[PDB]
Amino acid sequence: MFEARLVQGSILKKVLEALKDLINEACWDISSSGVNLQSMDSSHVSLVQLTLRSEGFDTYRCDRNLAMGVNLTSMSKILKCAGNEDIITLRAEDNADTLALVFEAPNQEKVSDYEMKLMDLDVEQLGIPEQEYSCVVKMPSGEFARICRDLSHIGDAVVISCAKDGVKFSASGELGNGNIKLSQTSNVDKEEEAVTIEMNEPVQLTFALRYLNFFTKATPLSSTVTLSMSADVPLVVEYKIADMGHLKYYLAPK
Amino acid sequence: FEARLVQGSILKKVLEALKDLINEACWDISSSGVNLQSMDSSHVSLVQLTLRSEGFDTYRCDRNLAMGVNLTSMSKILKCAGNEDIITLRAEDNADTLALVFEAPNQEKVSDYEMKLMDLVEQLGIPEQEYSCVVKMPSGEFARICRDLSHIGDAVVISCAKDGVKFSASGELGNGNIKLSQTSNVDKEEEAVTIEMNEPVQLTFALRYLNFFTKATPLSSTVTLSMSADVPLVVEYKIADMGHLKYYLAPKI
Amino acid sequence: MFEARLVQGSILKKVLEALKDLINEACWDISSSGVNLQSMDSSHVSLVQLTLRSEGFDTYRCDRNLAMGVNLTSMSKILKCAGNEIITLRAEDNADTLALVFEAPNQEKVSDYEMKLMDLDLGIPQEYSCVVKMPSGEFARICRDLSHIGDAVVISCAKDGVKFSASGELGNGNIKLSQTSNVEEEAVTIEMNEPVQLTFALRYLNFFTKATPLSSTVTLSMSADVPLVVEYKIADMGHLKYYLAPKI
Amino acid sequence: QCSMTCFY
Amino acid sequence: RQCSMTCFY
Ligand SMILES: *Cc1cccc(C*)c1
Ligand SMILES: *Cc1cccc(C*)c1
């Protein structure tokens, strides 16, 4: 008896557009705390941790722990029919094999009613210890999006080098070389337009750009992205879901 | 004949409406107006365009001329039209070519195109019928609903009653049910939903042809749907200060 | 060492987008006078002549003649990574790579790219019969418009107007611009010495059209049996000149 | 389904 | 290389 009413469905819309392309099949663990997704990709290179919390929904009601097998492509298609101001209602029965989506317009005159198939879950949900990282950059999401797009033309790999004074992105492909460098902002009149670095040990890591573009697709959710990297451990691309959850992407270095 | 029109955007929109669904049609020109009435390729749908004499800025016709036009070439030529260029459609008493003339008011540019006409137009009759259910909604909302439900399946199920219309699809990735309700406001030209129910209707239609009909959305702010059992669906658009487009499609049965 | 500092990178971006589709690999001749390109298209049909001069650049410094083999698509991508609002081209006396440095006026973001070169492997003469001076935008329209009617264009220059004509299997089209002038300015002006009636192919003029955002005015230069010259001037920095051989 | 020549 | 993935968790 899962029933979640949320009024700004844009968020739920955006999340789908974020995760539609990276993960094909996912498993939503529904509990009395919130909706939690944690999955990998085909070749086990990246990891996605989505967490939306009970206090964010306008009406959360859960009875038993539900394990739903979702096809995020079909689901993204169904929420494509969702208005950005539409109110979305997730619903399911304690044992049902179908998830019900209800899109309802602010002016109570249109009620779209969709029902998606669930499938057999078979996911190994490993744990990722929330840890303390050597380098932690906190920048606007738009410029990170820029840099990833720009450097995606040069090569298939990026080299992030965090130091004491600046963050540096570097690519080197079959058609040349590229080096973008962002620096520390002082006192800018916008909290979400500032770059700040918290260094404890300079880091020198090599990642793949395709998955960074995948992660970049989640840009409209937050104005600020946080990168967290350290030697030999994965990079954490984190977007805040304003007053409700978090989205976390992880990548294993070269 | 000779038809002078100042706001060519309208005619551009009409062509963009019918350019893609119907390829070649027949234009019956008379002293009353331009009349098009055609079918599609797979003989499923029907288009009825009517532009009236009073809408043109200078309309002059003498006798009924029946010219066979290929709306794709004409649509390209109307893509070549200037937005401020006063447009003159023209034709010779017996010539096999239709002339389009775009002319700038003050400037010095005159585009002059001449398209070849043709001659085969099996025009069936439309009894002036009374339909069981008649909904009048914004064209944008019909466009939305068709687009949205086009992702689920190839068919739509319209169920009209006294207070609300219901759209239903069932495809390879689920099912969908949209429902529109009545108006409660004092000013809602293209914001209100109204139903003219005499007997609730339950009809099954194809979504591809509805999207083809939908492409004509920027023409009018209001669409009128007309349904009855076993008879085709009537999707009607107003052409502001001229005529009308009426699309007919045969149900699934 | 070559070093060119430029403030309006919009120009260079526009140029790259212009010739990106016509030429695949090119020869950039950089000297102390300016950057000069002269190449043909696929199967060596039509000709492109780019000339940017040192006096246009904000900081020009050249030492030796540089001949760089560029893949204009890669350069177009790198200048797509360029903000429209400071661009630095650079190269070493013997280096096999061209360096692009994008820097914001306010010290915030500094992109540094270095592109690999490739391996390199006639003179441009005339007095023309008809010489038209029109806006580039209307040339763009008319070329596209008549490209919808047919694949070939017929320019007919006379004493009062230029005329464009196409003729395909579904009709014909004829646009005509005329020589209106007042005391109030004039918009289209022609320097005619003998009326011209010439037939060209529309695909290459549509190629030439991509250079429209460079200048607001294009100059057409035509004469019988000799190529058509489509010329756009760059704000005293240089010019782009396209040459196309007429039909028989 | 129904063709549109059934009708009219 | 490409580390894949856990390998790390
Ligand atoms: C041909 C035909 C007969 C009866 C009903 C329909 C919809 C079509
Ligand atoms: C870094 C690395 C090399 C080979 C295999 C794995 C999982 C990781």
Task: Lay out the secondary structure.
The complex is a heteropentamer, with 3 copies of chain A and 2 copies of chain D.
Chain A: E1 2-6, H1 9-19, E2 25-30, E3 34-40, E4 46-53, E5 59-61, E6 66-71, H2 72-80, E7 87-92, E8 98-104, E9 111-117, E10 135-140, H3 141-152, E11 157-162, E12 166-173, E13 176-183, E14 196-199, E15 203-208, H4 209-216, E16 224-230, E17 233-241, E18 245-251
Antiparallel strand pairs in A: 1-5, 1-7, 2-3, 2-6, 3-4, 4-18, 7-8, 8-9, 10-14, 10-16, 11-12, 11-15, 12-13, 16-17, 17-18
Helix pairs in contact in A: 1-2, 3-4
Chain D: no helix or strand
PDB class: replication
Keywords: pcna, DNA replication, peptide mimetic, replication
Assembly: pentameric
Task: Give a written overview of the molecule.
Chain C: The modification Phosphotyrosine is found at residue 204. The complex is a heteropentamer, with 3 copies of chain A and 2 copies of chain D. In chain A, helix 1 (9-19) crosses helix 2 (72-80). Chain A is built from 4 helices and 18 strands. By secondary structure, chain A is α+β, with helices and mostly antiparallel strands. With 8 residues, chain D is mostly loops. The chains are: A alpha+beta (254), D little secondary structure (8). Chains in contact: A-B, A-C, A-E, B-C, B-D. The interface between B and C is medium-sized, with 17 and 18 residues. Bound molecules: 1,3-dimethylbenzene (2 copies). One 1,3-dimethylbenzene binds at residues 230, 251, 253 of chain B. The site of one 1,3-dimethylbenzene has 3 residues of chain E.
